Design a protein around this motif. Structure first.
Motif, PDB file in Angstrom:
ATOM      1  N   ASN D 101       0.751  -1.038   0.003  1.00 19.37           N
ATOM      2  CA  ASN D 101      -0.242  -0.038  -0.112  1.00 19.37           C
ATOM      3  C   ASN D 101       0.674   1.525   0.132  1.00 19.37           C
ATOM      4  OD1 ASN D 101       0.919  -0.840   2.305  1.00 19.37           O
ATOM      5  ND2 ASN D 101      -0.954  -0.877   3.410  1.00 19.37           N
ATOM      6  N   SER D 103       2.852   3.291   0.387  1.00 19.55           N
ATOM      7  CA  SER D 103       3.741   3.938   1.727  1.00 19.55           C
ATOM      8  C   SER D 103       4.635   3.233   2.530  1.00 19.55           C
ATOM      9  CB  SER D 103       2.571   4.309   2.905  1.00 19.55           C
ATOM     10  OG  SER D 103       1.884   3.218   3.385  1.00 19.55           O
ATOM     11  N   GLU D 104       4.767   1.932   1.874  1.00 18.17           N
ATOM     12  CA  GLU D 104       5.900   1.269   2.312  1.00 18.17           C
ATOM     13  C   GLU D 104       6.870   0.914   0.917  1.00 18.17           C
ATOM     14  OE1 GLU D 104       4.597  -2.612   3.841  1.00 18.17           O
ATOM     15  OE2 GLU D 104       4.276  -1.733   5.916  1.00 18.17           O
TER      16      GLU D 104
END
Ligand SMILES: *[C@@H]1O[C@H](CO)[C@@H](O[C@@H]2O[C@H](CO)[C@@H](O[C@@H]3O[C@H](CO)[C@@H](O)[C@H](O[C@H]4O[C@H](CO)[C@@H](O)[C@H](O)[C@@H]4O)[C@@H]3O)[C@H](O)[C@H]2NC(C)=O)[C@H](O)[C@H]1NC(C)=O
Ligand SMILES: *[C@@H]1O[C@H](CO)[C@@H](O[C@@H]2O[C@H](CO)[C@@H](O[C@@H]3O[C@H](CO)[C@@H](O)[C@H](O)[C@@H]3O)[C@H](O)[C@H]2NC(C)=O)[C@H](O)[C@H]1NC(C)=O
Ligand SMILES: *[C@@H]1O[C@H](CO)[C@@H](O[C@@H]2O[C@H](CO)[C@@H](O[C@@H]3O[C@H](CO)[C@@H](O)[C@H](O)[C@@H]3O)[C@H](O)[C@H]2NC(C)=O)[C@H](O)[C@H]1NC(C)=O
Ligand SMILES: *[C@@H]1O[C@H](CO)[C@@H](O[C@@H]2O[C@H](CO)[C@@H](O)[C@H](O)[C@H]2NC(C)=O)[C@H](O)[C@H]1NC(C)=O
Ligand SMILES: *[C@@H]1O[C@H](CO)[C@@H](O[C@@H]2O[C@H](CO)[C@@H](O)[C@H](O)[C@H]2NC(C)=O)[C@H](O)[C@H]1NC(C)=O
Ligand SMILES: *[C@@H]1O[C@H](CO)[C@@H](O[C@@H]2O[C@H](CO)[C@@H](O)[C@H](O)[C@H]2NC(C)=O)[C@H](O)[C@H]1NC(C)=O
Ligand SMILES: *[C@@H]1O[C@H](CO)[C@@H](O[C@@H]2O[C@H](CO)[C@@H](O)[C@H](O)[C@H]2NC(C)=O)[C@H](O)[C@H]1NC(C)=O
Ligand SMILES: *[C@@H]1O[C@H](CO)[C@@H](O[C@@H]2O[C@H](CO)[C@@H](O)[C@H](O)[C@H]2NC(C)=O)[C@H](O)[C@H]1NC(C)=O
Ligand SMILES: *[C@@H]1O[C@H](CO)[C@@H](O[C@@H]2O[C@H](CO)[C@@H](O)[C@H](O)[C@H]2NC(C)=O)[C@H](O)[C@H]1NC(C)=O
Ligand SMILES: *[C@@H]1O[C@H](CO)[C@@H](O[C@@H]2O[C@H](CO)[C@@H](O)[C@H](O)[C@H]2NC(C)=O)[C@H](O)[C@H]1NC(C)=O
Ligand SMILES: *[C@@H]1O[C@H](CO)[C@@H](O[C@@H]2O[C@H](CO)[C@@H](O)[C@H](O)[C@H]2NC(C)=O)[C@H](O)[C@H]1NC(C)=O
Ligand SMILES: *[C@@H]1O[C@H](CO)[C@@H](O[C@@H]2O[C@H](CO)[C@@H](O)[C@H](O)[C@H]2NC(C)=O)[C@H](O)[C@H]1NC(C)=O
Ligand SMILES: *[C@@H]1O[C@H](CO)[C@@H](O[C@@H]2O[C@H](CO)[C@@H](O)[C@H](O)[C@H]2NC(C)=O)[C@H](O)[C@H]1NC(C)=O
Ligand code: NAG
Ligand code: NAG
Ligand code: NAG
Ligand code: NAG
Ligand code: NAG
Ligand code: NAG
Ligand code: NAG
Ligand code: NAG
Ligand code: NAG
Ligand code: NAG
Ligand code: NAG
Ligand code: NAG
Lengths: 147, 449, 147, 147, 52
Positions: D101, D103-104
């Protein structure tokens, strides 16, 4: 009026900015006088070596004209204005770079003597152009998307 | 109507063009294969997947008699031989006096001659007697008796390197970017005018370069019937190209066995010659079957009569003179150069109503001059062992006599010496076109100020 | 649907305007069949000259394909529309150039026979394209900046 | 900060997206070390052939660097975004292509190991880019002109 | 009576006198679009990962 190639070399900065497409198409498409390098049907042996020794000297000036052209066209893509023969880059004209005032430049100076005064500062004027575009492309446009 | 120009890039339109194509041969590893003069340092490995994109509704005009692919194939062939034979050894020492004699003791009809001459050893101050076995075509007389080679006046006989190999290998002619090749697929295409079925091709099929006269070997066949094809049919000086729909097989051999000597010339450069007849002296010959040849002429006569008249008499004669290159049938098979006498095939009349083969006697010579350049000549080194060949005959090159008389009897003869009839009979269905991408068209678009 | 290179040569102007990216990428990136010119590892001497005589004939068709491509891509930058495979140039279609009406052109004509009729007037249609762009770039945009 | 060529090879996708102009200008204008190929004034004969055999090997790497550059610059013109070093193409990220997702990805992954995961799907991600641009250029813009 | 070691097979080419064979440092460079990577690990036996 189009006076031919470099015809506006003695005119003003104001009156020679009408002729910018001339020194652009004759910077590359003056090569139409070099495409004759596909020569006439050669004869037999006896100077088959002379045909290729003089073939490279014709082709170094073809390739060198191309790959000096692209790196000056790409540099306009770094500044944010590709394609346009006139673009505006939103970098403040520092008053230590040059002089008088806006109006004795476009009316009674030529580009050649203008290029002399600003040649000493050209690598720092090119320095701010790639910074006022990077701040717009990665910061502003991805913020004005989501907001 | 008030309209505004719009500009389109990539529009599929053409103009006719002239350019130089890509050799583009097929390729393998060839780790032990000998450098081969036809490809190697000229070609690049072939696109393995040609795509023949069939066009709709397109009707283009072709012309095989003004094509440039035939005109530059004849120029590349001279330049492929003339660039390979730069390193090869010159046979300048062999312009000496030969003490020769007959080989047999009882003459029936001789062929070989047995000679003797001096040759340098390793140290180039000592001379020794060497012999060889030259054919009688390649030896002329000065004045026991003393002979010499056929061209010590004008020519430098360049010995073809032994590491070489000349052999038909299919060359694919390809166009670089910005150019395209168009192929006709109409089956009635006599060679000119509109072709109602056109498809763009990246690279043509692989033609096998074979240099022959009077008969077209290993060619490409027709589709339904025999295709007779000429330029200005009523003109005498124009050759008549014939193309078969079914191949006519031939079997050729040199039935005498030979070995090679290794008479050296200089440090690192030797010379090969004929040494011994291990066996029995026999004439080289070729077989054509008779029942297949008499039916293949049953078709060429049938469609000649649509060009001249039904009730005419069609006859075949044999020749009327010239050198060996144009009176006979030339090969290049197995490394040797055969010149067969074909006065037994072209001999019959036609009057409008099993296993017996026709034998053709055949000569051999090993100092050839191809294209008759002044002061140049080649030399083919002898092949160790007997030679065997199998080939198909797909086509003829006739010519018409035509004086001004009133008779109803046409006579057609085989024709020889111009290599552009070998190539124009293969690249007839092609044309190169140029791709112009920019175009303008009126519309209602308006840049929006 | 993509029929391959030049597949829409017999279709209409309406139905062949779907396929413009095909004749553009195969105008340059059909050179992928020529990058094999970095050949296999050559052997020793004996035809070292044949390796470079046929090397120039391979490279004239590489360079000539590149420098005929750039001068037709640059010309779109003179008209004001670079990058776009479809642009609109705001020049009125003079009714002396051609004919019927807008609707028998896109439905039952091909581009080849269309190119025949308008080839006689192409150097004057290209003349107005560089004039309706120069009036916009140097006059209008520098006036709409300060006003 | 500019660390030089490829200096951000070990940084994150977030922190290495600051340095995109470095691997672009050194992809072409690192050829300034090759323009020395116009050599010094050569002497007489005796190796006049060696001068041109090594002349082609210098020029194949000049031409090959140019004509691999243009076909990757043109491909951005097919997608609708030419010139820009960052463009956005309006194609939905199918969640079968990749993973976690948003953001990683930008905080603790590098571009090299990111390129590994998405290399298997790159020819289908490039497939939708030329379709969400064709629908805009020929359909939408000629409809929003007349309406 | 003697002779040289290779009059059978070889053409002994006399090296020109205007020549000079001598070690001079060659730097191998990559053209544009290519790069060369140098290991700096001091235990590099010749294979596997180089952490620097
Ligand atoms: C018309 O087409 C036919 C069909 O291809 C063609 O026949 C081919 O002729 C070649 C002649 O080179 C044949 O190749 C030879 O075949 C024999 C068969 O035993 C081999 O022994 C040969 O190997 C030798 O090749 C070199 C000769 O010195 C040596 O260097 C090597 O070490 C071997 O000793 C060689 O492969 C080929 O087999 C036939 N094809 C068929 C299907 O039989 C014919 O030549 C064409 N017509 C003309 C006029 O060219
Ligand atoms: C090869 O095929 C082509 C076409 O199939 C042949 O071209 C045809 O040549 C005849 C010659 O008589 C043309 O007929 C003449 O037409 C003109 C007007 O064009 C007219 O004035 C004459 O009275 C006569 O009718 C014919 O038009 C032409 N075909 C086409 C489609 O134009 C050609 O002759 C063939 N070659 C050989 C050797 O047979
Ligand atoms: C040069 O250095 C490299 C790395 O420093 C050496 O590679 C190492 O080789 C050993 C061989 O035994 C590997 O060990 C084996 O690993 C496998 C699983 O990969 C396991 O099944 C075996 O039981 C054994 O443990 C070792 O993994 C490998 N190093 C790395 C980092 O993979 C190499 O041997 C050195 N060369 C010489 C000549 O010594
Ligand atoms: C050749 O072009 C025509 C365009 O005129 C293609 O489309 C045909 O057009 C006619 C008249 O408009 C219709 O009657 C046909 O039904 C159309 N064809 C189809 C398949 O619908 C035609 O398709 C093109 N030729 C080929 C072989 O595709
Ligand atoms: C070797 O063979 C040749 C070929 O038959 C013989 O050539 C003859 O030469 C004489 C000389 O003028 C001619 O008159 C004959 O016509 C030639 N042919 C024949 C069949 O005799 C030659 O005689 C032979 N060599 C010897 C020594 O007899
Ligand atoms: C060609 O002539 C040579 C000599 O001129 C023949 O070679 C001789 O053959 C006999 C065999 O009876 C030997 O005794 C001699 O020593 C050979 N001479 C030399 C110099 O080697 C050769 O046989 C002849 N060839 C043919 C086919 O008749
Ligand atoms: C080299 O050329 C000469 C001249 O043609 C040849 O000698 C003969 O010369 C007379 C008079 O000049 C001609 O009538 C003969 O026809 C010539 N004979 C031949 C066979 O041409 C000589 O034979 C030639 N030598 C070679 C090796 O061809
Ligand atoms: C042509 O002659 C050679 C000899 O010069 C023949 O090769 C010999 O063949 C026999 C039978 O197989 C072997 O015992 C010999 O060892 C071979 N000799 C060599 C030097 O290899 C060859 O068979 C003959 N060809 C024909 C068709 O008869
Ligand atoms: C040319 O030679 C081939 C052999 O290479 C001949 O083919 C043979 O023909 C006979 C008689 O019909 C058959 O029994 C054989 O089976 C054929 N061989 C093969 C391998 O099929 C051919 O007949 C010869 N052609 C001519 C015109 O003589
Ligand atoms: C076939 O061609 C040959 C020569 O190529 C012709 O042979 C000549 O025939 C006449 C008889 O009319 C002889 O007097 C000549 O001596 C022959 N010439 C040679 C060189 O020997 C022959 O006439 C032609 N036609 C036929 C049907 O065989
Ligand atoms: C080609 O072959 C024909 C026969 O197939 C040759 O014609 C023969 O010529 C000789 C020469 O006088 C005559 O003795 C024969 O009687 C002829 N044969 C026939 C059947 O008439 C012809 O000469 C050969 N070509 C060449 C150039 O010699
Ligand atoms: C020479 O002709 C023969 C006869 O066509 C070709 O051999 C094959 O013959 C069979 C007959 O059973 C045909 O069905 C094939 O199409 C023929 N070709 C192939 C490739 O199998 C032979 O190929 C011809 N020679 C050349 C070089 O094409
Ligand atoms: C050239 O090669 C020959 C052949 O090897 C050398 O002569 C001798 O020949 C015998 C029998 O052939 C061999 O057993 C000897 O070993 C050869 N001697 C040598 C030194 O190789 C001859 O000497 C060679 N010449 C040169 C200049 O190397
Ligand atoms: C203008 O230039 C001088 C020297 O080039 C520099 O010190 C100064 O910061 C610049 N900017 C100004 C005065 O805004
Ligand atoms: C610009 O500067 C010059 C001299 O520094 C002065 O004479 C002139 O009045 C200035 N103003 C203008 C041209 O508006
Ligand atoms: C250009 O730079 C040099 C070096 O600082 C300086 O001496 C000279 O005055 C400068 N000239 C101009 C016109 O700025
Ligand atoms: C070939 O066949 C035809 C028809 O059967 C016959 O008239 C003729 O005599 C045969 N032979 C030749 C050489 O034409
Ligand atoms: C010749 O025969 C063909 C065969 O069909 C025929 O069509 C043609 O009319 C005939 N010509 C004459 C003049 O009899
Ligand atoms: C030429 O034809 C005649 C008549 O049919 C025949 O007797 C003769 O044998 C033929 N010539 C050859 C060389 O077969
Ligand atoms: C249209 O073209 C004609 C000739 O090309 C020209 O005389 C005329 O001025 C043009 N413009 C119009 C009628 O608006
Ligand atoms: C266009 O012109 C043609 C002939 O000039 C006419 O038949 C047609 O009605 C016109 N109008 C259209 C297609 O709307
Ligand atoms: C093309 O120009 C020529 C020269 O004026 C003229 O004769 C011809 O009719 C023109 N053709 C078209 C289709 O406008
Ligand atoms: C996502 O990808 C899969 C396989 O690549 C495909 O079947 C599916 O249609 C795609 N789109 C979605 C789920 O919207
Ligand atoms: C993203 O996914 C990971 C594991 O799938 C989860 O731990 C995390 O809470 C998710 N949400 C974020 C980072 O907002
Ligand atoms: C890449 O594709 C292959 C072939 O389908 C597949 O086996 C492999 O798991 C894929 N890897 C990734 C990371 O998607």
């Amino acid at each position: 009026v189009f006076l031919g190639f470099l015809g506006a070399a003695g005119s003003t900065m104001g009156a020679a900015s009408m002729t910018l497409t001339v020194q652009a198409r004759n910077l590359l498409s003056g090569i139409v006088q070099q495409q004759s390098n596909l020569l006439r049907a050669p004869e037999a042996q006896q100077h088959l070596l002379k045909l290729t020794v003089w073939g490279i000297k014709q082709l170094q000036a073809r390739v060198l004209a191309v790959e000096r052209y692209l790196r000056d066209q790409q540099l306009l893509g770094i500044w944010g204005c590709s394609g346009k023969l006139i673009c505006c880059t939103n970098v403040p004209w520092n008053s230590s770079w040059s002089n008088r005032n806006l109006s004795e430049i476009w009316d009674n100076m030529t580009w050649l003597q203008w290029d002399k005064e600003i040649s000493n500062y050209t690598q720092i004027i090119y320095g701010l152009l790639e910074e006022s575009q990077n701040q717009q492309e990665k910061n502003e446009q991805d913020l004005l998307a989501l907001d | 109507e008030n309209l505004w120009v719009t500009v389109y890039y990539g529009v599929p339109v053409w103009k006719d063009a002239e350019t130089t194509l890509f050799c583009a041969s097929d390729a393998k590893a060839y780790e032990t294969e000998k450098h081969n003069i036809w490809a190697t340092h000229a070609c690049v490995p072939t696109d393995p997947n040609p795509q023949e994109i069939h066009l709709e509704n397109v009707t283009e005009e072709f012309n095989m008699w003004k094509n440039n692919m035939v005109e530059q194939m004849h120029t590349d062939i001279i330049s492929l031989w003339d660039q390979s034979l730069k390193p090869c050894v010159k046979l300048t020492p062999l312009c000496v006096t030969l003490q020769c004699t007959n080989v047999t003791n009882a003459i029936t009809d001789g062929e070989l001659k047995n000679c003797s001459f001096n040759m340098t050893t390793e140290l180039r101050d000592k001379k020794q007697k060497v012999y060889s076995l030259f054919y009688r075509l390649d030896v002329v007389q000065i004045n026991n008796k003393e002979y010499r080679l056929i061209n010590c006046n004008t020519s430098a006989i360049t010995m073809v390197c032994p590491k070489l190999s000349f052999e038909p290998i299919p060359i694919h002619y390809c166009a670089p970017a910005g150019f395209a090749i168009l192929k006709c697929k109409d089956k009635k295409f006599n060679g000119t005018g509109p072709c109602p079925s056109v498809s763009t091709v990246q690279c043509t099929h692989g033609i096998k370069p074979v240099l022959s006269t009077q008969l077209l070997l290993n060619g490409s066949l027709a589709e339904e019937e025999v295709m007779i094809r000429s330029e200005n049919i009523t003109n005498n000086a124009k050759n008549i190209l014939v193309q078969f729909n079914t191949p006519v097989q031939i079997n050729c051999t040199r039935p005498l066995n030979l070995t090679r000597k290794s008479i050296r010339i200089g440090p690192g450069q030797a010379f090969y010659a004929m040494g011994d007849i291990i066996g029995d002296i026999r004439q080289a010959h070729c077989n054509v079957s008779k029942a297949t040849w008499n039916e293949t002429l049953g078709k060429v006569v049938k469609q000649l009569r649509k060009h001249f008249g039904n009730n005419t008499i069609i006859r075949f004669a044999n020749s009327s003179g010239g050198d060996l290159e144009v009176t006979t049938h030339s090969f290049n098979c197995g490394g040797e150069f055969f010149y067969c006498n074909t006065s037994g095939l072209f001999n019959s009349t036609w009057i409008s109503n099993s296993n017996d083969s026709i034998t053709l006697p055949c000569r051999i010579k090993m100092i050839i001059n191809m294209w008759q350049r002044i002061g140049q000549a080649m030399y083919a080194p002898p092949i160790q062992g007997v030679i065997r060949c199998v080939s198909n005959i797909t086509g003829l090159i006739l010519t018409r006599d035509g004086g001004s008389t009133n008779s109803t009897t046409e006579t057609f003869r085989p024709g020889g010496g111009d290599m552009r009839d070998n190539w124009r009979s293969e690249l007839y269905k092609y044309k190169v076109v140029k791709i112009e991408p920019l175009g303008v068209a009126p519309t209602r678009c308006k840049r929006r100020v």
